[PDB]
Tab-separated table of C-alpha atoms in Angstrom:
chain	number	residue	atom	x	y	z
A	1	UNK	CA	-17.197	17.031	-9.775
A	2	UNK	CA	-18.122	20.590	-10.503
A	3	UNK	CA	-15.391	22.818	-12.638
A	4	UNK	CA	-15.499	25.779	-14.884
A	5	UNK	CA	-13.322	27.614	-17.792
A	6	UNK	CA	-12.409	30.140	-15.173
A	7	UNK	CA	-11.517	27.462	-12.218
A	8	UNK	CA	-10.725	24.322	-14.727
A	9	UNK	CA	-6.939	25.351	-15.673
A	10	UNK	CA	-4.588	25.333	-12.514
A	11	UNK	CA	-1.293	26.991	-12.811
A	12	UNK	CA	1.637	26.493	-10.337
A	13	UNK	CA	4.651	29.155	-9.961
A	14	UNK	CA	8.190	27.811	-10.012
A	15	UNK	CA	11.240	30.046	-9.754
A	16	UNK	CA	14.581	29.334	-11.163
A	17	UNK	CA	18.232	31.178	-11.059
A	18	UNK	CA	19.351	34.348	-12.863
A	19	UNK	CA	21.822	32.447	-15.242
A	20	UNK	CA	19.582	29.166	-15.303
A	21	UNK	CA	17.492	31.242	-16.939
A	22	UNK	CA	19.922	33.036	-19.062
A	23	UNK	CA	20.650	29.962	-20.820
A	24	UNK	CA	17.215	27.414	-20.244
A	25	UNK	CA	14.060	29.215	-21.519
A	26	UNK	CA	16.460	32.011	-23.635
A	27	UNK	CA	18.469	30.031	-25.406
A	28	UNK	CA	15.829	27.111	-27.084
A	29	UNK	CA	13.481	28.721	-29.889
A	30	UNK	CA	10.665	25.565	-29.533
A	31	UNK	CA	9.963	26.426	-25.830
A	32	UNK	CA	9.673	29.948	-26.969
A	33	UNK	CA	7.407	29.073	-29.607
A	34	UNK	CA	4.983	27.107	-27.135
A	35	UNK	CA	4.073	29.813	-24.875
A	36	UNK	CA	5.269	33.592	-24.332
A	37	UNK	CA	7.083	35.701	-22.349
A	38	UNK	CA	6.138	38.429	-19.454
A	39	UNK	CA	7.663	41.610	-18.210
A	40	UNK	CA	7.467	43.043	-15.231
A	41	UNK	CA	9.431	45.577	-15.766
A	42	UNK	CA	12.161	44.377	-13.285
A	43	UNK	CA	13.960	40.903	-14.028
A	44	UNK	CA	10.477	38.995	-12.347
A	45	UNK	CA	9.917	37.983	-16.409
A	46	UNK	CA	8.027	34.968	-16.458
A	47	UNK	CA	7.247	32.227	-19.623
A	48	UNK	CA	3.689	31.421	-19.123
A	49	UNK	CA	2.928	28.081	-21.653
A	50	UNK	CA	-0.440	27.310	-23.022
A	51	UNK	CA	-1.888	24.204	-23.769
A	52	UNK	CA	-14.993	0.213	-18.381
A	53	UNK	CA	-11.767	-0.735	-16.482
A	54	UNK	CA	-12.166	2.969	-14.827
A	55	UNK	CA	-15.783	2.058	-13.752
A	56	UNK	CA	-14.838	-1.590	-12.547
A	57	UNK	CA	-12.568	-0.014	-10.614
A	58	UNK	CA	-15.302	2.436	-8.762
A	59	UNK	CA	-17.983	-0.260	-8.570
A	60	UNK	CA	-15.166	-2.685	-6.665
A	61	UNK	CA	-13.855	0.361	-4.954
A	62	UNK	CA	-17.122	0.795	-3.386
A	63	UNK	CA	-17.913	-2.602	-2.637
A	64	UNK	CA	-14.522	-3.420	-1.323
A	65	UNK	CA	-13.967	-0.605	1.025
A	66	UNK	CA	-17.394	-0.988	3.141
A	67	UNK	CA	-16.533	-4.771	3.428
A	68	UNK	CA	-13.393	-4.046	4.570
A	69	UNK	CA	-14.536	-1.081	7.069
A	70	UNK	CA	-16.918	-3.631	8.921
A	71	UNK	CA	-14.298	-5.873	8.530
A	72	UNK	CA	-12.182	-3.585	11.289
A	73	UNK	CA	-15.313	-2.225	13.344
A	74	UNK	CA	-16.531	-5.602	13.838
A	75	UNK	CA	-14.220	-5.732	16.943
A	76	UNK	CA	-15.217	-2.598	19.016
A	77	UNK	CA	-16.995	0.687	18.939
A	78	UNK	CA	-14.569	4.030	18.208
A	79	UNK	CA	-14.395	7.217	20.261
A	80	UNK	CA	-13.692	10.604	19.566
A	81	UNK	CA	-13.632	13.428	21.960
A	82	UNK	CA	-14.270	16.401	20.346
A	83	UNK	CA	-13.410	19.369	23.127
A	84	UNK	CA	-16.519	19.195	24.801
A	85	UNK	CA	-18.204	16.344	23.420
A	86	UNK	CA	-17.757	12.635	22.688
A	87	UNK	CA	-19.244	11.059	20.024
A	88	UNK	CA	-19.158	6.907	19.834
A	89	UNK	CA	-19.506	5.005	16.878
A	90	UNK	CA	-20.068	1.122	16.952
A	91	UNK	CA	-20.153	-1.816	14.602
A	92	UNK	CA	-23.766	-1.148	13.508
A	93	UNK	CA	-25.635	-0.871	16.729
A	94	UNK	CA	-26.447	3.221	16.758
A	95	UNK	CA	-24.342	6.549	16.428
A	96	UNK	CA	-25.004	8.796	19.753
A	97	UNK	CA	-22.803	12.473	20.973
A	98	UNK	CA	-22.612	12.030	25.056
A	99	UNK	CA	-20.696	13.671	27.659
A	100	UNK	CA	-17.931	11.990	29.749
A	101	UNK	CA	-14.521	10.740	29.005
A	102	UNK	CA	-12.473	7.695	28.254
A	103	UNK	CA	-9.983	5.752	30.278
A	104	UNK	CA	-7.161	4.989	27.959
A	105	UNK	CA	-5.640	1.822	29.298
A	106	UNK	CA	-9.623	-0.482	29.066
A	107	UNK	CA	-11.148	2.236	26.409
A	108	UNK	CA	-14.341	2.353	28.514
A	109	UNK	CA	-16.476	5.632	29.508
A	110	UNK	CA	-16.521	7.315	32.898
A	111	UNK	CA	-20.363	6.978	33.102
A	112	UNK	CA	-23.091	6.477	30.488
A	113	UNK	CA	-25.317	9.974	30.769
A	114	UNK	CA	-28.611	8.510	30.682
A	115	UNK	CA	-29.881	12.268	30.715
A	116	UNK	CA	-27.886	13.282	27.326
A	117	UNK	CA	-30.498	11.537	24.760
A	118	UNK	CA	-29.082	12.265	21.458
A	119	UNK	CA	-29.605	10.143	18.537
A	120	UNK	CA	-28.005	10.555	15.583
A	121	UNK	CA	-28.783	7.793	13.316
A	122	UNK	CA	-29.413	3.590	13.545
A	123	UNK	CA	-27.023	1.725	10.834
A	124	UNK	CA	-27.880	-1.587	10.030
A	125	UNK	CA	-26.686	-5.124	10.685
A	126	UNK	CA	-27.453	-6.397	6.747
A	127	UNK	CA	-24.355	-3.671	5.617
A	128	UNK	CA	-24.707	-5.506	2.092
A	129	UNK	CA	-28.109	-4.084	1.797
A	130	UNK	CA	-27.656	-0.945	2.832
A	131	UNK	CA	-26.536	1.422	-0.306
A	132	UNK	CA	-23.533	3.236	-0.279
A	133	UNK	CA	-22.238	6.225	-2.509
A	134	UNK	CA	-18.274	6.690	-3.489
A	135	UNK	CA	-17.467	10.707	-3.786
A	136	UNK	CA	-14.288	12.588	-3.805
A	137	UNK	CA	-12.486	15.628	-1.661
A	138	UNK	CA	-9.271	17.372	-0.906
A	139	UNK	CA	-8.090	14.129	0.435
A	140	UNK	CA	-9.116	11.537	-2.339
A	141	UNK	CA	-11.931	9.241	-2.632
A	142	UNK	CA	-14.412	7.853	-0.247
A	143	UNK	CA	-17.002	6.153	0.684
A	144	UNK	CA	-20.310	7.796	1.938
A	145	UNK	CA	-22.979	6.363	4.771
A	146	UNK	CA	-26.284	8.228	5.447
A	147	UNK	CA	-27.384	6.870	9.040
A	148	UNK	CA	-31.264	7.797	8.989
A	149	UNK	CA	-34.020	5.961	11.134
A	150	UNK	CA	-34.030	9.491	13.499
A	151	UNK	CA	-36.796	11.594	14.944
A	152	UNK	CA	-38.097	14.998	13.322
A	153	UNK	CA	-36.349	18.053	14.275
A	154	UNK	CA	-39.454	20.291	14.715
A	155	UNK	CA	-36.991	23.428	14.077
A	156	UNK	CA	-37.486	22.925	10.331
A	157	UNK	CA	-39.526	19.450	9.827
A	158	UNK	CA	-36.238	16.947	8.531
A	159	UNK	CA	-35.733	13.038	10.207
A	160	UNK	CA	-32.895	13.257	12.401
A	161	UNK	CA	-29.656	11.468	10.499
A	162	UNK	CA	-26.180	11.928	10.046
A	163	UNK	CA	-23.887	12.066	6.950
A	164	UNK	CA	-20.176	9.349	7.304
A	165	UNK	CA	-17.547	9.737	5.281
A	166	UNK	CA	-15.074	6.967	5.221
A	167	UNK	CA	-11.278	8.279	3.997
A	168	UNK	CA	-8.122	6.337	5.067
A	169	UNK	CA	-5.997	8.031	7.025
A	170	UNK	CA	-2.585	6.949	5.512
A	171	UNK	CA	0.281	5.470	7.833
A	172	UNK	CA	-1.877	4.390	10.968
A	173	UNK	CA	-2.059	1.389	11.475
A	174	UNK	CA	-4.733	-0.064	14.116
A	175	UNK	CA	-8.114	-0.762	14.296
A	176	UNK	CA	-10.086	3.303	13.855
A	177	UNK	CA	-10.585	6.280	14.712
A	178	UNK	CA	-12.003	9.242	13.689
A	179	UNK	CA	-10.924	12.797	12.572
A	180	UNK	CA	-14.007	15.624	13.507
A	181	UNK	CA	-17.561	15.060	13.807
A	182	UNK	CA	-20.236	17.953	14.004
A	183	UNK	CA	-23.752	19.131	13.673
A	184	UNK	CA	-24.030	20.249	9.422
A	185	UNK	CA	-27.706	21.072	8.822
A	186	UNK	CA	-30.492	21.456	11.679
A	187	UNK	CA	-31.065	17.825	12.376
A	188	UNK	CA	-28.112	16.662	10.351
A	189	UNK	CA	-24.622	16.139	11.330
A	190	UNK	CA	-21.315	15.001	9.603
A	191	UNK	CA	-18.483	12.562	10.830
A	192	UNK	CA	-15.335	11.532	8.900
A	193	UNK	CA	-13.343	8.344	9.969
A	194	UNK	CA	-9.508	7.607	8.863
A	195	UNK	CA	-8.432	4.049	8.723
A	196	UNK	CA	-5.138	2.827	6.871
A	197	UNK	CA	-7.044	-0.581	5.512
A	198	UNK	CA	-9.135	2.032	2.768
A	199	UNK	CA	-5.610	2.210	1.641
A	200	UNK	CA	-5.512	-0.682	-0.401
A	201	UNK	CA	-7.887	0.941	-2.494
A	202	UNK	CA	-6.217	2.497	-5.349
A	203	UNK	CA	-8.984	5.165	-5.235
A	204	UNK	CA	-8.930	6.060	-1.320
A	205	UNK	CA	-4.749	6.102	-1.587
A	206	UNK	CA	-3.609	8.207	1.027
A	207	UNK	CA	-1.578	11.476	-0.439
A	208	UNK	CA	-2.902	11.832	-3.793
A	209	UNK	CA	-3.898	15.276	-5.062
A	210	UNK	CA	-4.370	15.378	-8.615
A	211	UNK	CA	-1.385	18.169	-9.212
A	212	UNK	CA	-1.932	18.599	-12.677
A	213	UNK	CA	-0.886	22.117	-13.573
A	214	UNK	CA	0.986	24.053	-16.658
A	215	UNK	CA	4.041	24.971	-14.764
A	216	UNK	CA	5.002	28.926	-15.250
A	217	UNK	CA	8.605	29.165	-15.199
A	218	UNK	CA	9.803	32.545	-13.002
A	219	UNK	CA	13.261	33.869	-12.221
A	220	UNK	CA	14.154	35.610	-9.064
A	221	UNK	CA	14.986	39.595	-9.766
A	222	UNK	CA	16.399	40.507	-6.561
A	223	UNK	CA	17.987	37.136	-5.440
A	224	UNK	CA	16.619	37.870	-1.491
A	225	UNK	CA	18.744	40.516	-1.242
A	226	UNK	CA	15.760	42.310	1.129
A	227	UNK	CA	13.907	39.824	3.768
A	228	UNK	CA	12.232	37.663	1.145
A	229	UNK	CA	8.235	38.123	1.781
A	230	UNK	CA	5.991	34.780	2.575
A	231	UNK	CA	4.873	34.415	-1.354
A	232	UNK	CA	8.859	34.332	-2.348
A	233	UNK	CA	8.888	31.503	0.790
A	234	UNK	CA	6.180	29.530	-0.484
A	235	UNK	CA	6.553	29.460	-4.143
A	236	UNK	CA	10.491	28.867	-3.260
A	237	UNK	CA	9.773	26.310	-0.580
A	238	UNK	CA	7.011	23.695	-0.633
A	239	UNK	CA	5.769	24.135	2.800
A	240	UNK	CA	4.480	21.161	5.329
A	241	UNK	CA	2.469	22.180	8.655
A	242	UNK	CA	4.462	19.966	11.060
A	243	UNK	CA	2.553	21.257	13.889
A	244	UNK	CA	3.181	23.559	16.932
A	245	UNK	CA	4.061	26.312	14.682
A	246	UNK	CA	6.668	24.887	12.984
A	247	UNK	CA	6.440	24.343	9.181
A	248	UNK	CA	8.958	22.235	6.814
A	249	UNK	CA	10.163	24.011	4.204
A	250	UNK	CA	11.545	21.734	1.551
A	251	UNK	CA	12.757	23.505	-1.204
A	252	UNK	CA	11.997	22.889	-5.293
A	253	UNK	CA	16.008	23.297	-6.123
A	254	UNK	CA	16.773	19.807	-5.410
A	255	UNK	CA	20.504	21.136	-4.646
A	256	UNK	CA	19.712	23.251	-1.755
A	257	UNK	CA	19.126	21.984	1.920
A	258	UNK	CA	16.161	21.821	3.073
A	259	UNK	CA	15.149	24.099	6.715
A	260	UNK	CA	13.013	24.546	9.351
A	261	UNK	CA	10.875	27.426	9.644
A	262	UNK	CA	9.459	28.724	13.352
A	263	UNK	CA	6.269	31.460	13.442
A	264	UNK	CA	5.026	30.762	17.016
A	265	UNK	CA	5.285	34.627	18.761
A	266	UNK	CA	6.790	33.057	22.199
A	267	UNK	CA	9.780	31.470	20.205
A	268	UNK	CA	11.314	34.872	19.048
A	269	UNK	CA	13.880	35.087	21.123
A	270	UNK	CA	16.541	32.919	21.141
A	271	UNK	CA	19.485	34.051	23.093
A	272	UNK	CA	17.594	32.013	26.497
A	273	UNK	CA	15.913	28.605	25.230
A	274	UNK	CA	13.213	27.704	27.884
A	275	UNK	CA	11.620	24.206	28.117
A	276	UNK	CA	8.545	25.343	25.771
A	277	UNK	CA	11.079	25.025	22.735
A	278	UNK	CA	12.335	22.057	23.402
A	279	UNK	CA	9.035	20.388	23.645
A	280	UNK	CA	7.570	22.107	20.912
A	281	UNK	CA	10.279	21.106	18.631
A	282	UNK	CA	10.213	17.231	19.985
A	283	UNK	CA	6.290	17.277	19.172
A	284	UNK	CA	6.987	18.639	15.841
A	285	UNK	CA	9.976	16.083	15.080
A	286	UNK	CA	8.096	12.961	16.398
A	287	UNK	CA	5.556	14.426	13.566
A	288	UNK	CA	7.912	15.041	10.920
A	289	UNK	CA	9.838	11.333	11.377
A	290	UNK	CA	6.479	9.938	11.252
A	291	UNK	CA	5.610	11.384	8.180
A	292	UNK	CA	8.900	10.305	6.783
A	293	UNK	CA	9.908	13.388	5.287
A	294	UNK	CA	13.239	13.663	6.225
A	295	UNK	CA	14.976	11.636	3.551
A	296	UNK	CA	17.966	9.258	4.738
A	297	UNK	CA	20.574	9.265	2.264
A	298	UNK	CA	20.714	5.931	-0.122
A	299	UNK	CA	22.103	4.700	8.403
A	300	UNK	CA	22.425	6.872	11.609
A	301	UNK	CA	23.485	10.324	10.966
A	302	UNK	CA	22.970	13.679	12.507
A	303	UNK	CA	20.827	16.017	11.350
A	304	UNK	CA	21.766	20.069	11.142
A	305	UNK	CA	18.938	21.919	9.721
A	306	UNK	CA	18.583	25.757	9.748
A	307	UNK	CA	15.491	27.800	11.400
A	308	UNK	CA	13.858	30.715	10.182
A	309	UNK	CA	11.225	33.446	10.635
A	310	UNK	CA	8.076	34.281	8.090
A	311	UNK	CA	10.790	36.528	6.169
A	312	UNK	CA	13.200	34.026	6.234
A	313	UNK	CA	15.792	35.417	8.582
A	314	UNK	CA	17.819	32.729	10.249
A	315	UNK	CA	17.943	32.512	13.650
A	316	UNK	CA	19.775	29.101	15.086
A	317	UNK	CA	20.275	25.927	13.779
A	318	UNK	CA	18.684	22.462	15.035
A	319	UNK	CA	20.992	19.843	15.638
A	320	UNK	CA	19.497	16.534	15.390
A	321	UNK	CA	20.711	12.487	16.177
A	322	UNK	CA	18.566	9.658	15.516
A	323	UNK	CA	18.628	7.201	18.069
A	324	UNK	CA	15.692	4.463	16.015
A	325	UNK	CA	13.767	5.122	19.305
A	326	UNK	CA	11.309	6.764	21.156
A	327	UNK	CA	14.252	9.202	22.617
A	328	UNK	CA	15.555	11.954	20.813
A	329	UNK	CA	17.655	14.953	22.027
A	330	UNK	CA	17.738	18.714	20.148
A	331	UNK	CA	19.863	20.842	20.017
A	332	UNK	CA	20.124	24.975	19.074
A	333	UNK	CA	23.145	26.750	17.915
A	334	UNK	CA	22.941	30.161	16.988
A	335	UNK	CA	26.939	30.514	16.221
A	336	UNK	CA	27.263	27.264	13.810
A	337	UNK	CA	28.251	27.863	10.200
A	338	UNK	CA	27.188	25.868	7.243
A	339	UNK	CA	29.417	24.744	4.321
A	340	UNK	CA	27.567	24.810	1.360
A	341	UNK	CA	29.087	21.662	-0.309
A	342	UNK	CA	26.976	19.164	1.626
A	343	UNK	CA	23.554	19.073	2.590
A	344	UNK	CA	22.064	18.409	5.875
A	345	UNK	CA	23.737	15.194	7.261
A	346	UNK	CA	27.223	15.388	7.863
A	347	UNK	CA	28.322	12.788	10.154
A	348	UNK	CA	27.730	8.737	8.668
A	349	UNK	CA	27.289	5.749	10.652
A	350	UNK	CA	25.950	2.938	9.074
């Protein structure tokens, strides 16, 4: 891992209320001590504070995961089409990019271009002699495979390989599949595969970003009286891409109710809904349930959740029943009004 005294320290901005912060930073001398205050002229003042086993763990990590990877390719091959090509990956045989298509219900190719010879590395049977590197990304930890035994690239001179990266890829279960794959040097390309057996792995864990950061308590000076800008929405809100331009804004005051936010240009107006925003929305629920954000209290319940622009201007408000299915229905009301007691679900059936 590369780092720096300029890059090392990582900060994160939290915001708390006007009379929170009357009497929770103001009022104790010891937090005062450890740290200092800033001005910005307006009430945006911010206090800014200043301040083997591991190797067993890598060497079995290692070990572990590749066994285990083989363990799920033995069965088949894996496909991925990416746009306009397909690249296949099998249980040691050879890694090729052809053209064609799969049938979903066998898994088998249209055709087999014999006139599309690309070769982009020969694995080998013997996995527990080939050697096998364990790096770290965004993501976590993994495990790296350089496929070589390629021709020379006469563009610069380099043996034609490829560079697999093994990460798991959290709550899917199955056998595997993988995420992107594409050309990275001249005669080099790179591939990364998600399976949820890496899991096990304390290392390759799926949603673990080392958020260590000396928080910098903030206090909001205007209280969104004006449209509150993206920054105020995203050091407010913890955002969560839930696809087809709809984000998840769950906020840091545990209090509060969580809401939708919407910044696709075709779902401005909402006096008409169309069909678009109803399948939109179902895409981006079947997403969010899967990635069990929604919280369930402690049962069936209903699920009213607001939905707003990039300045955080309401617009309607998503009315949601969980069926434990693959059916859902949504529904949009732009003249419902909240009560501020009670969070999102309001109606309980256990």
């Amino acid at each position: 891992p590369i780092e720096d005294p300029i890059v090392s320290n990582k900060y994160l901005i939290s915001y708390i209320d006007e009379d929170d912060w009357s009497d929770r930073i103001l009022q104790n001398q010891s937090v005062m001590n450890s740290g200092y205050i800033v001005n910005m002229g307006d009430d945006l003042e911010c206090f800014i504070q200043n301040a083997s086993e591991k190797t067993a763990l890598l060497t079995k990590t290692l070990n572990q995961g590749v066994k285990t990877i083989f363990d799920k390719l033995n069965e088949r091959c894996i496909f991925y089409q990416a746009g306009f090509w397909i690249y296949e990956y099998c249980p040691g045989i050879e890694f090729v990019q052809f053209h064609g298509r799969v049938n979903t219900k066998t898994g088998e190719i249209v055709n087999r271009d014999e006139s599309l010879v690309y070769r982009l590395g020969k694995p080998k049977a013997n996995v527990e002699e080939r050697e096998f590197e364990l790096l770290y990304d965004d993501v976590g930890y993994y495990i790296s495979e350089i496929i070589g035994s390629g021709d020379i690239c006469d563009v610069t001179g380099a043996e034609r390989m490829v560079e697999i990266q093994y990460v798991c890829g959290g709550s899917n279960s199955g056998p595997s599949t993988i995420q992107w794959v594409r050309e990275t040097k001249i005669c080099v390309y790179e591939a990364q595969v998600t399976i949820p057996e890496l899991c096990n792995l304390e290392l390759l864990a799926k949603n673990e970003d080392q958020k260590n950061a000396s928080p910098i308590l903030c206090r909001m000076p205007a209280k969104s009286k004006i449209g509150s800008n993206s920054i105020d929405l995203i050091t407010k809100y913890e955002p969560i891409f839930l696809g087809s331009g709809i984000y998840f804004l769950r906020p840091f005051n545990t209090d509060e109710r969580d809401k939708l936010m919407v910044t696709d240009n075709a779902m401005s107006n909402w006096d008409e809904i169309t069909e678009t925003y109803y399948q939109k929305f179902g895409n981006a629920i079947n997403k969010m349930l899967s990635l069990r954000l929604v919280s369930l209290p402690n049962d069936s319940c209903v699920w009213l959740a607001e939905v707003v622009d990039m300045k955080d201007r309401f617009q309607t408000t998503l009315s949601l029943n969980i069926l434990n299915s693959q059916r859902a229905e949504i529904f949009f009301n732009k003249t419902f009004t909240f009560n501020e007691d009670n969070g999102n679900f309001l109606s309980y059936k256990i």
